[PDB]
Structures are given as C-alpha cells and as structure tokens.
Amino acid sequence: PQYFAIIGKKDNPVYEIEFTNAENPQGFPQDLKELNPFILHASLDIVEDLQWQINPTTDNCYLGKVDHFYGLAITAYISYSGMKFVMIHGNSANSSVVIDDNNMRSFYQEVHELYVKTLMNPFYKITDPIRSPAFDSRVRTLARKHL
Amino acid sequence: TVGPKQAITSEASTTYIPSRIYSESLLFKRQEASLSAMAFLFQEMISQLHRTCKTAGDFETKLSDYGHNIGIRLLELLNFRASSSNYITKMRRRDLKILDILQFIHGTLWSYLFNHVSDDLVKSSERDNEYMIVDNFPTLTQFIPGENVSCEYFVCGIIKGFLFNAGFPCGVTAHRMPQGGHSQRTVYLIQFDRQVLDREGLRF
Amino acid sequence: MAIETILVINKSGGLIYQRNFTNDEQKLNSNEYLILASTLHGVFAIASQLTPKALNTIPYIPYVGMDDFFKEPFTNWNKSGLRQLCTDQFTMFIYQTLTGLKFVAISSSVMNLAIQIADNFLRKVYCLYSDYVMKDPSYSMEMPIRSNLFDEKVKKMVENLQ
Amino acid sequence: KQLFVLRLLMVALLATPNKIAWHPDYRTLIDTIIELLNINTWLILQKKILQLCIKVSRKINDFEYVAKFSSILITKYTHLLNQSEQDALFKEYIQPSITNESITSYWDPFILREVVINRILDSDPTSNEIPAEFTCRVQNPFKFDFTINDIQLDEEISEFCEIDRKAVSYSGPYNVKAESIRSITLPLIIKKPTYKKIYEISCLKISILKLPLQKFDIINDSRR
Amino acid sequence: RSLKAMGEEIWKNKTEKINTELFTLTYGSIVAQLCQDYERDFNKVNDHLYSMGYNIGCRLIEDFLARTALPRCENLVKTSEVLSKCAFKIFLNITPNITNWSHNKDTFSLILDENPLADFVELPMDAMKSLWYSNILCGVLKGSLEMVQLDCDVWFVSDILRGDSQTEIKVKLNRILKDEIP
C-alpha cells in the first residue's frame, strides 16, 4: 500500500489518497491514522532542503527516495510552481523503489500533467483542495497501470 | 466528493476501471486572433478599474493582481510544454538561479505572449538586486497617451506573478525612459528582497 | 488634393477635433468652429432633403499616403448628401461614415479625381481614428479628442501627402 | 523533524502506566509544541497535536490548559470534528471545565439572530395614542437563537436585557437544539412608563450554565 | 467579391495577430475576479459582463466598418451572413453558421461549433445553472448591432460548458426606422 499526497507551499495538502493491494483489504495496520501524516510533514523539511541545491546527494524536477524510515521508502517530486508530490511506499517487508523509476517517473510526469490541467482553470485558485472526482478516476487508473 | 479537508479514503489498487468523462490535449494548437479584440478587452479592463477605484496606487495593485493571476497559471504551462504528455518526455532544468529565469522570460515568455522576442535585458551597475527588462515598443498598450504609466503595470503584474510563485519573491515597478527614436520604451525594474539574496549568498 | 486644415465633428453635436495646422499663422478658432460645425450638421440634412426629379457611388485606389490600409476599390455611405464645397480660396472635402460620423478637410487648393483622393484620404483618417481613439480607455464617448498620439499620426499623414 | 520527535516524546509519555506530577518542563514543552506550528495551513495536524495536548494536560491534571485548548479547538468547530463522535470527547473534556474555573464567554458571539419585538393587541378601540420605532402597548415580545456545534446540552439559563428600562423576563431554564435554530418562547416584558426619547439597544444578556455573560451581539450589523 | 472569400483576404492584411491563449487567460482572470468580488452571486455577473460587452461593441463597430467598407445589410439574412462570415472571422478566428430561423424570419440562431474564448475552463458546481461563461459577445452583439440601429435583444439558450450539447445564441430584432440622412 502507498499513501499519495500533493502539498502546497504554506504546508497544506491539496490532494491526498491511500491505495492498497487487494490481498490486504485493510491496508497500513495502525500506521494510517497517526504515523503517515506526521512522517510526510517530516519529509517536507528535507525536500525543502534539497529544492535549492544544485548537485544532489540533474534536472531537479524528479529526485529519488529521500529517506528510509521504519522500513518505509518515501519518494518525492517537485513541480515548477513549488508543489511537492511526496508519496511513500509501505510493505510488510522492505521495499525496492529504484527499480520502478522507469515507471514511477512516468507516473509523476502525467500526474504533473493532470495538475497542470487542474491549474489552467481560472476559477481554481491555489490553496484550494482539489475537489474533483474526475481527478480521482484518472489518478487511480494511473495507480493501477503504474503499480 | 473525493477529497475534503477532513479525511483520507482507502481504495484498493487493480480494481475495476471507472467511467470516462472529460479530457483534452495539453499541447497547443496554433491559434491566432486580431490585435484589436485583445486591445478592446484591455481598455475595458482599464475602464472598469478606472470606474471602481479612487486613487492611483490601489488601481496599480489591482492591475498587478490581474497580471498575477495569469502569471501563476502561465509558469507551469510553459515549462511543461517546453519540457516536451502521453508522449514520452522528461523534465527541463527547473532553473534556480536569478540570471536564468530572466533569460527564460526574455527568451520564451515574450515569444509566447507575442510574436517577437523581448529586446534587451541588462543589470544595474549602481546597485545589485535591480534588473532591467526593456522592450522598444509595448504591444499591450500602444493606444493610450504616453504620459500615463500606470496602465503599463498589467504586464509587469505578470512578471511578479511569474517570479513570486517560482520561488523568488520580488516587487516590480515600471517607468518610461524615452530613449532614441522610440518615444515609449517602458523599463520594468524588479526589486527583490534581501532574504532571497543572502540565500544565494549562502550558495557561494 | 492638398489638405491644409482638419476638422472632425460629432455624429449628433458640436465638433470633437480641429486643427488649423500647416498654416504658419494665427487664425481665430475659439467658439465659431462649434457654430460652423453645427451648421454643417444642419445643412447636411437640408442638402439631403431636396430631391431633383431623377427617379454607382464607387471609389478607386490611387495608393495615397506614405503597406496601405486597403488594396481594393470600396463603397460609399452618402448617396444623397453633401460631398464637397467649392469657393474662390478653398474647397472643403467632406466624408461621413455609416454610423453617422462625419470628417471635414478644408483644402486651400483651388479649382472628379479630387473626390477620389479625398474619399481615400478621409477613409484612411477614419481608420486611424478607429485604431487610435476608440481603443483608448480614457476617451469617453462623444467628447473632444485629447490624444497626443493621434496628432502625430495625422501630421505625418498630411506631410506624407505633400 | 523536531515537531515529530517532540510528538514522539509526548506520545511516549502518554502511554506510560505510571503517574507523574506537575513540573514546568511540561509547561515549556506545551508552549513550544503549540507555538511550533503557527497556530496563534494544514489543520488535521493541528488537531492531531492539540488532541494529544489535551490528553497530556489531563494526565498532568492542570485543568486550565484543557479548558484553554478546548477553547482553541473551538476554532475548528465547523468541520473535521465529526458528528458527535469526537464532539463527545470535546464535551467530556469541557464539562469538568465548566464545573470549574472555565468561565469564558461561550466560545463565540455568533449565537443571536435578529429578534422581533412586536406586540399583539386585541381591541380596535385602542390603537396608537400619540401627539423604526415600535409604539409598544401590552402583549409580549419574542426572541429566537441558535447554536452551531454538533454537541447537545447547550443550556441557556436566565436570559434578560441590558441597562435599558424595567423590561424584565421570567425564567428560561430549558434546552436549545444542536444544529437547528430553536425559537425560545415568550420572554414577557412587564414595561414601565418613561419618556418619549428613543435609544436603540445592542443585545441582551444570556448565560450558558454560568453567570450571565456579556452582549453576544446580533449578526451582520448591529440590527438596531 | 463574395464575403466568404474576402474575409480571408482581410485575415491576411492589416490584422496583427496575437495568441488566442492570452485572450482566454485575461478573460478568465476577469470573470474569476468578477466571481470573487460579487460574493458568489452569479446572476449579477452576467449583467456586468453584458455591461462590459455593450461598451466593447459600440466602439468595435467603428473599427470593423473602417477595416472593411460594407453597405447596409438590406435584409437581416445578410446581417446573419456578415456575422457568420466576416465579423467573427476577422476579429476571432471562427466561422459560425446560422440555423433555426423563425418562420416570419425575425429570429436567428448562431450555432457555434467551438469557442476559442474558453479552452481550459471548468465551472464550479454552484455556478452550474446561473452563469453563462462567454457572455461578453452578447453585449457585443447588442452594441455593434445597436449602432447600425438594428435594435435587437441578445440572449443564450445553451452551451457546452454547462453540460448541454451545443453553444448557440438566438438574436431577434424589434424595430429599425432610423439611419444617417445621407
């Protein structure tokens, strides 16, 4: 299971979704209610640290797994307007994420495309939650096809 | 009813495909319109703001907010279309110096808003954090008498809206320096703050 | 042919624009131009009113000016109305527009083709009026012309004519 | 990350089976964890910090802070505190406060709507003796009022007026509803003859199981 | 010679081109600010966009007649042909066509296949019954047509952005009996 989020510049979320494998019909045992918002706000610190630097620990829009913490692989992405696309990776065992950078990158690229399609609405201003079910339908089909 | 400010939903991956409702191509088709129609909408903008405002200053800030609401849109659209959709593409530089986002403006923004590239772009010798962006002929506002400058703030309202949302907060004012054969030349100067500069003071 | 004094009147009132430019002299302009513009407004209606028992109107392009504004022969919106006035010292060329707005060029040249070059020139100054006054947001409707830019847009046109 | 490890300290101190007395390191810890988020953005995390801060200040047994952070959790009233489930614990952390020092002026002045002060005579033989304003005579006035929280047991007691004339009331010890606008019944002014001069009134005094508080003025205007 | 031919000729002389996306962005910022400052009361902003469009069209007609010289439209089907073939073809790059006349030929519907005034726009849900988005043309289609003394009234029926199938505007004229004496 994976918790996905898009966070504003003033530390607020515009999108949040949690999606799991169907074998575990309930997902993230006891971490979902308490741990997963807090470790994401913790990772916002180090994504804010690496946004301004030149040579990382190329092209600065994607970046790798940013930390590893209670066996959870936390993967980020930084848009052009400053939005941050932090999405974590859970499993009962340890998880490999770097092998999915052939696929994950493409996933962050077209959800960036979806966010640009959201932003081009003149009615939708920033610091608003993305309250659209069509956006949910596209991001869960992209979650299915980029598993 | 998907994302409120109240909770997060949990739904399984690899389930059924849901309905298809709305979609559109992000890449631009090449569309053209007359200069007269956009000039008419521009003077109607300035006429309504002349009608519903008292003095010059808050009129200028309202016009700059009008430009801001194009610029914060326009940043991601131009960078995403300069990176290249469903077609396989990567991610540009996402530039983070001061001296190359102004290069990005003078190269791509003015050649996107207008047919022609922006003319000159120089620094200030007398002081740092002051940058000159200059054209020779403003095609937004060529239809007003030249002694008023406040109607020229809309386009620099774009530029502040291009800059503050990109991570470099700043402030812009515009003046008219009648140099050479061009009677209207329209310098826009960009005043940054100290808190960005020492940031790139920290980065060697 | 040669144009020496320009006058733009209202569609329903006293005039908006007047210039006695390129006459290197001082003539009176204060408050008699409003009276004469109102009498032109009256006698256009009087000159249209009488009908001789009759019971065309096409211009030609001479490439006047200086990419011109139009490259084809065109049409006219005053079939039965005053078109010029001819005296000893001047000929006055008038051209009205379909909305009711008229344009007056007092020409000090003395004594057919003059109507063609006059209608072409006054259609070009109608084009510059539309492109440089009606676009202005500060210009309210049916007020005197205050644009400084319209001045050197028409001075250069007249000094390009001769 | 300092926010996360102070949360870890506070939740590890929460789950102990022992008991611990008051100590001002807890005081400076509570002020730096409240001031650490910019509280006085994300709101779910602010709820999840002060929902632990109220439990720690209960476990320390200092009721001034559970009263204070309950009257800071009143800012997040109209969303993200669900339909009397978390408002049940928001009650059971505020009932021992309201039976103790928490005597603040019921969390908001946005309770009273625009009341109407008509009177209903029954005789056509008497009508408006004289030589907007109301021209009162007898009958009685009427008020209506609401609260907006998901909790129950908002209890008005002894609703009466200001430093105006001998307009009085009788008794008001009954309830008012949770979400709706319950119209409170007849207050029955027993008015006294005075001088002709007009002067409007802002509001009237209502206690919520306390002493009678200040104004709680009318919404959107003074509504004279 | 024919209007449907020479409109393209005016489309390649003395029409300085500008990108339509900028026009959409400034119109979207106008209607977004108008939505915001009127406290989400969506019936007033159609009236305010009409009051802007009247002052657009009453100055636009004197530029349209200046750029292309035409005689007066002797019947209103010629008015429909010039609005279909040169008025929206010179200024915008769109060719709408006319359908759905009244039987006495007083009313005409201007079906409009795609609108280049609203590309990226998705309306909010509370505004989905009481805001016609591209209202501004209706003021133009009063104003310009009120200055050639075709005293008409202009109103929408349906649009694609409100979930209906098509965008069309139905205009009918009331009286004329007025014009320049010449």
Side-chain angles (χ1 to χ4, degrees), chain A residues 1-19 22 25 27-147, chain B residues 1-82 84-204, chain C, chain D residues 1-113 115-119 125 131-224, chain E:
Chain A
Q2 294 90 347
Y3 188 115
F4 169 69
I6 306 175
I7 318 294
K9 296 183 290 294
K10 183 174 72 68
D11 283 341
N12 62 6
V14 293
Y15 195 54
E16 69 275 16
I17 191 167
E18 167 51 76
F19 63 94
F28 263 80
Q30 184 66 41
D31 303 336
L32 74 165
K33 295 177 293 296
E34 293 83 4
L35 271 193
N36 285 327
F38 273 116
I39 65 170
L40 188 153
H41 191 207
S43 50
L44 279 196
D45 164 21
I46 60 178
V47 178
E48 192 186 330
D49 209 340
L50 281 71
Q51 65 182 357
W52 287 126
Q53 62 84 30
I54 304 105
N55 61 6
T57 192
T58 45
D59 71 38
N60 316 127
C61 183
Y62 180 46
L63 73 164
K65 64 91 176 179
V66 65
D67 209 306
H68 193 167
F69 185 109
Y70 312 137
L72 307 174
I74 61 171
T75 56
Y77 182 76
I78 284 173
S79 75
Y80 297 100
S81 165
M83 296 296 172
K84 296 184 267 284
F85 280 65
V86 176
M87 182 277 287
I88 63 170
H89 291 269
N91 201 350
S92 292
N94 279 84
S95 51
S96 69
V97 286
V98 189
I99 203 177
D100 187 74
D101 298 12
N102 51 4
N103 164 270
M104 160 258 126
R105 256 154 64 247
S106 75
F107 176 76
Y108 290 164
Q109 280 189 350
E110 61 264 347
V111 77
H112 197 160
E113 183 178 1
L114 261 52
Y115 177 57
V116 175
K117 272 194 208 54
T118 307
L119 176 60
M120 285 286 95
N121 187 354
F123 291 103
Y124 162 69
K125 65 182 181 180
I126 65 170
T127 77
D128 273 342
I130 315 176
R131 204 217 319 278
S132 165
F135 191 34
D136 189 0
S137 303
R138 319 255 158 186
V139 66
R140 66 187 47 202
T141 48
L142 294 174
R144 157 153 60 246
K145 303 313 175 313
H146 282 48
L147 183 63
Chain B
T1 72
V2 170
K5 293 187 286 185
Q6 275 71 245
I8 190 167
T9 56
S10 163
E11 282 85 9
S13 66
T14 69
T15 52
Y16 66 98
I17 175 167
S19 158
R20 179 54 52 94
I21 297 90
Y22 165 87
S23 170
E24 185 185 58
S25 170
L26 188 70
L27 61 84
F28 64 97
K29 65 179 72 66
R30 193 60 262 157
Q31 291 312 112
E32 299 271 38
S34 59
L35 182 47
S36 69
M38 183 278 288
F40 269 129
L41 187 55
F42 188 56
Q43 53 84 21
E44 201 45 65
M45 206 150 67
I46 302 173
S47 80
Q48 292 326 288
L49 296 187
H50 265 82
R51 166 166 311 179
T52 60
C53 182
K54 305 285 106 174
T55 181
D58 44 354
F59 165 77
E60 292 179 353
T61 69
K62 278 183 206 73
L63 206 45
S64 179
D65 283 18
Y66 274 120
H68 199 96
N69 290 318
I70 295 90
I72 61 183
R73 260 84 181 186
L74 195 55
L75 171 58
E76 287 259 357
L77 169 70
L78 282 182
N79 286 45
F80 211 91
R81 279 212 284 245
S84 162
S85 68
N86 309 318
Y87 158 91
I88 302 102
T89 89
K90 226 332 213 234
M91 54 169 148
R92 271 199 69 238
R93 172 72 261 167
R94 171 246 184 186
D95 49 329
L96 61 94
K97 284 331 310 183
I98 284 189
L99 294 174
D100 48 358
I101 190 167
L102 293 149
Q103 183 66 41
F104 180 56
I105 286 182
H106 155 270
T108 312
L109 191 86
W110 282 60
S111 57
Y112 173 72
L113 298 193
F114 324 116
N115 63 6
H116 79 305
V117 188
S118 171
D119 286 337
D120 291 331
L121 169 72
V122 298
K123 314 173 44 61
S124 190
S125 70
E126 61 86 20
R127 196 187 297 112
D128 216 357
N129 80 17
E130 285 317 295
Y131 288 83
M132 296 299 103
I133 176 68
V134 284
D135 55 322
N136 309 136
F137 190 60
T139 187
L140 277 297
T141 186
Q142 52 187 359
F143 290 153
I144 317 188
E147 304 307 318
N148 216 8
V149 65
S150 72
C151 306
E152 294 179 354
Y153 272 11
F154 170 80
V155 64
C156 65
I158 282 170
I159 306 172
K160 178 164 75 173
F162 194 78
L163 277 176
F164 155 79
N165 207 276
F168 323 106
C170 78
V172 298
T173 52
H175 322 281
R176 266 176 83 246
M177 295 298 103
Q179 166 183 320
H182 320 275
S183 170
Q184 59 271 14
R185 197 200 174 196
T186 71
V187 64
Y188 322 110
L189 62 84
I190 303 172
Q191 283 254 20
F192 296 88
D193 53 308
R194 181 51 53 175
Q195 302 54 30
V196 64
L197 295 165
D198 62 357
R199 193 193 82 208
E200 61 86 20
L202 191 144
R203 316 198 282 108
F204 43 81
Chain C
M1 295 144 67
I3 307 299
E4 282 85 30
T5 294
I6 207 71
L7 282 294
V8 181
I9 62 170
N10 192 317
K11 65 179 73 175
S12 292
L15 74 164
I16 61 171
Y17 184 55
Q18 62 89 11
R19 295 283 76 79
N20 46 2
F21 78 111
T22 64
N23 314 67
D24 61 357
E25 67 204 4
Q26 211 290 322
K27 299 289 94 176
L28 267 75
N29 56 69
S30 63
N31 309 316
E32 88 260 27
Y33 290 170
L34 274 299
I35 301 170
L36 62 83
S38 55
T39 52
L40 275 296
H41 209 297
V43 302
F44 209 100
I46 305 175
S48 52
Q49 206 170 350
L50 62 84
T51 180
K53 301 316 150 196
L55 267 57
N56 207 341
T57 59
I58 141 133
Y60 269 157
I61 177 174
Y63 197 78
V64 68
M66 192 263 300
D67 210 3
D68 50 8
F69 290 169
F70 62 92
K71 292 264 215 196
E72 61 275 61
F74 60 97
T75 179
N76 169 274
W77 301 317
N78 61 6
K79 286 173 65 63
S80 71
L82 188 153
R83 297 276 296 289
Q84 65 182 357
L85 188 153
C86 178
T87 61
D88 309 303
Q89 315 183 264
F90 51 78
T91 55
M92 165 204 305
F93 293 126
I94 191 167
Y95 181 76
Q96 80 164 354
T97 75
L98 193 52
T99 75
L101 184 74
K102 328 183 212 293
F103 289 82
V104 174
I106 288 176
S107 171
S108 185
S109 282
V110 181
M111 179 195 47
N112 189 19
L113 186 136
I115 301 299
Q116 315 276 328
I117 182 173
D119 273 8
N120 279 289
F121 180 78
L122 277 296
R123 170 138 174 269
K124 290 191 170 214
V125 76
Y126 181 49
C127 280
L128 285 194
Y129 165 71
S130 73
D131 191 359
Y132 281 89
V133 175
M134 292 305 337
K135 302 312 192 40
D136 177 71
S138 67
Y139 170 71
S140 171
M141 294 299 291
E142 273 58 45
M143 300 334 307
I145 306 302
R146 206 47 54 76
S147 178
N148 45 57
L149 185 52
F150 195 26
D151 295 338
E152 66 253 25
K153 285 310 169 167
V154 297
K155 302 291 95 175
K156 192 55 72 181
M157 193 154 37
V158 164
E159 293 179 353
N160 266 317
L161 179 138
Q162 65 182 357
Chain D
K1 278 274 187 190
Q2 180 203 329
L3 182 63
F4 191 33
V5 307
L6 289 163
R7 177 245 180 204
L8 275 189
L9 186 146
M10 182 178 71
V11 74
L13 190 138
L14 190 74
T16 184
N18 301 332
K19 181 266 290 180
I20 193 66
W22 189 90
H23 180 59
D25 289 328
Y26 291 88
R27 175 62 55 88
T28 69
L29 182 90
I30 285 297
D31 296 276
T32 194
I33 193 66
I34 297 304
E35 190 276 331
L36 183 53
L37 296 162
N38 299 275
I39 298 189
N40 283 84
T41 73
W42 208 326
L43 314 169
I44 291 298
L45 261 63
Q46 308 196 353
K47 178 178 84 72
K48 279 171 171 55
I49 299 299
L50 56 91
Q51 184 178 2
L52 301 201
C53 296
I54 66 155
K55 297 197 181 205
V56 176
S57 50
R58 165 64 68 84
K59 190 207 193 68
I60 289 309
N61 278 306
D62 61 357
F63 309 104
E64 49 273 44
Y65 279 155
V66 73
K68 166 179 208 50
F69 301 135
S70 295
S71 68
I72 288 310
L73 193 39
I74 68 164
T75 315
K76 320 183 167 55
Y77 66 113
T78 187
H79 54 285
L80 55 83
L81 277 296
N82 50 20
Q83 296 294 321
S84 284
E85 302 93 357
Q86 294 153 333
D87 274 308
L89 55 87
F90 190 65
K91 285 302 258 180
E92 310 306 316
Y93 279 118
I94 203 55
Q95 318 308 110
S97 296
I98 67 192
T99 73
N100 190 358
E101 61 86 20
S102 161
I103 52 178
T104 187
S105 179
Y106 187 63
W107 319 338
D108 66 327
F110 294 91
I111 45 170
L112 184 63
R113 298 291 184 183
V115 311
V116 297
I117 299 90
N118 71 323
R119 88 286 185 276
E133 302 159 1
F134 291 164
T135 72
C136 218
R137 238 12 135 300
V138 267
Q139 245 358 61
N140 173 300
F142 182 76
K143 293 53 181 193
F144 63 97
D145 185 358
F146 88 111
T147 190
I148 200 64
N149 313 115
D150 282 312
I151 62 170
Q152 197 36 257
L153 207 65
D154 177 10
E155 286 298 325
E156 87 296 340
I157 297 89
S158 165
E159 168 193 3
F160 55 84
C161 173
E162 293 199 24
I163 299 169
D164 204 0
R165 307 285 100 174
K166 300 289 94 176
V168 295
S169 190
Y170 185 65
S171 86
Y174 312 148
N175 78 320
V176 65
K177 193 44 73 180
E179 289 264 12
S180 85
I181 298 89
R182 174 169 98 99
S183 73
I184 185 53
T185 301
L186 282 153
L188 307 168
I189 295 170
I190 313 302
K191 56 194 86 70
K192 177 197 74 48
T194 302
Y195 203 70
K196 147 80 157 59
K197 184 255 185 178
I198 75 173
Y199 53 101
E200 60 97 19
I201 46 172
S202 73
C203 194
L204 73 165
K205 299 292 180 68
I206 297 90
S207 85
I208 310 299
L209 72 164
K210 289 192 212 310
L211 61 83
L213 295 174
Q214 68 273 25
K215 301 308 165 96
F216 307 99
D217 285 321
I218 316 170
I219 55 154
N220 297 117
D221 194 352
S222 285
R223 297 195 188 169
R224 56 101 178 176
Chain E
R1 204 271 320 171
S2 75
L3 73 164
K4 206 256 182 186
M6 52 67 79
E8 288 78 330
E9 181 38 57
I10 309 160
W11 188 236
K12 277 74 70 177
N13 80 310
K14 194 52 185 64
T15 61
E16 280 66 71
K17 311 296 194 314
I18 194 66
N19 319 129
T20 319
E21 269 174 338
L22 188 153
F23 187 32
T24 65
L25 286 191
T26 176
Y27 185 47
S29 159
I30 283 298
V31 62
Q33 183 52 244
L34 269 193
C35 174
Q36 189 274 331
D37 72 334
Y38 272 19
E39 294 190 354
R40 316 267 318 175
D41 187 14
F42 294 101
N43 221 341
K44 290 176 61 73
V45 309
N46 308 270
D47 297 331
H48 194 268
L49 283 188
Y50 207 65
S51 160
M52 293 177 70
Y54 196 54
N55 310 353
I56 295 281
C58 80
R59 312 161 75 138
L60 187 153
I61 197 61
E62 291 157 55
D63 166 81
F64 167 71
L65 295 171
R67 188 181 281 106
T68 186
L70 277 296
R72 296 175 81 107
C73 319
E74 51 272 32
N75 45 359
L76 62 84
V77 66
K78 197 69 166 171
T79 298
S80 73
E81 292 159 82
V82 301
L83 292 201
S84 165
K85 292 319 192 143
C86 61
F88 294 154
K89 178 56 211 67
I90 283 170
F91 289 120
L92 283 72
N93 188 13
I94 182 61
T95 61
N97 63 6
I98 315 291
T99 176
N100 297 323
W101 274 281
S102 43
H103 187 273
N104 52 352
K105 268 70 181 170
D106 187 73
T107 301
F108 69 108
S109 168
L110 190 145
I111 192 66
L112 188 153
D113 169 69
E114 92 285 0
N115 201 349
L117 212 67
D119 291 331
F120 298 104
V121 168
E122 181 48 80
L123 282 72
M125 202 56 29
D126 43 350
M128 262 285 318
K129 309 311 295 165
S130 296
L131 179 138
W132 292 271
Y133 187 75
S134 71
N135 175 267
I136 193 67
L137 282 72
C138 291
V140 175
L141 292 199
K142 177 182 190 186
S144 56
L145 292 180
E146 190 276 331
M147 202 75 108
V148 177
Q149 276 97 341
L150 277 77
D151 199 313
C152 65
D153 59 333
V154 188
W155 35 269
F156 293 102
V157 171
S158 73
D159 63 276
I160 177 171
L161 294 174
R162 202 181 260 187
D164 305 336
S165 59
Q166 57 189 20
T167 64
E168 61 86 19
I169 297 169
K170 269 202 179 203
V171 186
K172 68 181 178 67
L173 61 84
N174 301 0
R175 54 201 151 290
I176 46 184
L177 184 62
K178 182 67 181 294
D179 69 0
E180 68 295 3
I181 176 58

